[PDB]
Design a protein around this ligand. Sequence first.
Ligand code: HGX
Ligand code: HGX
Ligand code: FE
Ligand code: FE
Lengths: 286, 286
Amino acid sequence: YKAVEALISDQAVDSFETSPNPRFKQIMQSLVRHLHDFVSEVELTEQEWFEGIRFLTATGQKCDGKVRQEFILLSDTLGVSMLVDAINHRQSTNATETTVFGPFFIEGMPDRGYGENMALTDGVPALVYGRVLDVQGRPVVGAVLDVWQTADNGMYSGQDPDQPFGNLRGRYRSDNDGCFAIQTTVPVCYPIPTDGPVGEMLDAANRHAWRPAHLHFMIQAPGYRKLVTHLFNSDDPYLDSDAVFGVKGSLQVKYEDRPAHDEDAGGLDMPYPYKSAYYEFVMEAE
Amino acid sequence: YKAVEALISDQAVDSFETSPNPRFKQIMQSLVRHLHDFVSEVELTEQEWFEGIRFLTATGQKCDGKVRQEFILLSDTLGVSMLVDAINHRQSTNATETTVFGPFFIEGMPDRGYGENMALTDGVPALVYGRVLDVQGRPVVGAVLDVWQTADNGMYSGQDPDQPFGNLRGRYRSDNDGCFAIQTTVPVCYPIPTDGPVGEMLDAANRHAWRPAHLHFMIQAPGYRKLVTHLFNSDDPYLDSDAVFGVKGSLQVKYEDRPAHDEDAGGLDMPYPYKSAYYEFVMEAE
Ligand SMILES: CCCCCCCCCCCCCCCCC(=O)O[C@H](COC(=O)CCCCCCCCCCCC)COP(=O)(O)OCC[N+](C)(C)C
Ligand SMILES: CCCCCCCCCCCCCCCCC(=O)O[C@H](COC(=O)CCCCCCCCCCCC)COP(=O)(O)OCC[N+](C)(C)C
Ligand SMILES: [Fe+3]
Ligand SMILES: [Fe+3]
């Protein structure tokens, strides 16, 4: 006070001087200084400290071997996961912006044909179509687009093991002109889990637990850097308030109402009036 | 980048604007800004983030219902517990400096007489004696000093349930001249638990897990603020490198070698040559 308090923080930071790995040293000295500056800034009480301890403990304890990672959910809801993803995917070009994966990608889904339907359940029919291009605006041929989205129930198959195998998942490909087309249902918004400590924090914050409606993409092609991103429905009431801060301006796409037999359907002939979202992905060379 | 990254952190901080409790708002906005400044400063990689996630998870999972709180141990070893204790016990007077309790205090220990021995086990005999005074240097009469220390094995009774009930614990009292006297054994240094994630972090840091030798005091008297502190052996080889940063300059006390029948033994007549530590505690009025 203020020498006494400063001396405790110096010793804590200095304790790491000896780490053989200088990156680990770097990280721990930074983390300790920030942690101690936080505690000092707010003048954390002992009772508040006990709350932080009970909360962290409960968050770790909510992590099971299996289907629930509450620490990741805490990282997501405090914006750390999206910050980390941006830092590691910095871009100066017009390449499509990235996002986290989320926890819901599944390996070994069906390779689907151009315009193939992946919606095996009820929903509002949609055609999601567009191109995969390079930064010069030329088509990337044979790119692979792995896509996944929740059902109407706000569950991914088989996060929800009751949905059919491969439902609302598929691996599609861009054609000779870089065009792709996916038949699906309009994605719907869904809440993140709130039955753990993260739900308590969101409740105390008066924050809702919703994600805006989205479609997940992972796009790969020889010569290009892997792209993992989301396309978010333009109209979604949660676009400005994504619980995990996934939304970026350029990843929004409008689901337009189109006439039956619209001529601008990537060569498909749609039998009824339908919803359509058009998007051009831009990939970075490697 | 750098707008993109700044926008994610702003949204994460701003998400808490709505908290009904403005203290909770204050704390969470500060914590989020510090957390995001840390991640940005070091440019944390995705693999490092996964390590932080695995580590936090493992720390929470190491907490049992019962005898082990790994999050508290992490708070201690990163200097957060001592920082919190200082912030909440700020003093401008010559009052004795405070420390954390530690996890080892036990209720209902024996009320011991002046100079009573609390060492029921093997060790080097010591007389710890002194006074409890006010800030004006006058004796505090009938103060109660709850004291506890590890055995030679580096365990507290019955953290180590094999030691006798009350071993190296007692509740002593200051007399009409504020004098107290405690017979015990010279405290020995002991390591903190390293079989969990904190041990891994200390290993990576090339930090040892030792505490310098100490005696724990909690002193209470009517009219005065409760004092919880440690007296650390002056000669200890870990005094400058306490794993949990407990040591302060003024809490060190010399265990001097004294002659049999020394006249400066608080009125006790010690039968053999012995170790002696003299300390004057200064309590704050309430
Ligand atoms: C993986 C990356 C992330 C890791 C980063 C590590 C740390 C980040 C995680 C910390 C999150 C802690 C959030 C705790 C939630 C607090 C809470 O839920 O209860 C609220 C009241 O409690 C509080 O106000 C105290 C909050 C204390 C927070 C201290 C955290 C400090 C961490 C350091 C501690 C040790 C290292 C309820 O509000 P109230 O009920 O009073 O609000 C009033 C409104 N009502 C009554 C109508 C509800
Ligand atoms: C309660 C209050 C406290 C709460 C605050 C909340 C957060 C604070 C806790 C974080 C502590 C994390 C410490 C992790 C230990 C890392 C480790 O042990 O392995 C080292 C290598 O790993 C690493 O280098 C990566 C370290 C990554 C740390 C990231 C932490 C960021 C937290 C945010 C994440 C999500 C919110 C081994 O070194 P090496 O083996 O490479 O070293 C080389 C030397 N050898 C090979 C000889 C050993
Ligand atoms: Fe999703
Ligand atoms: Fe101790």
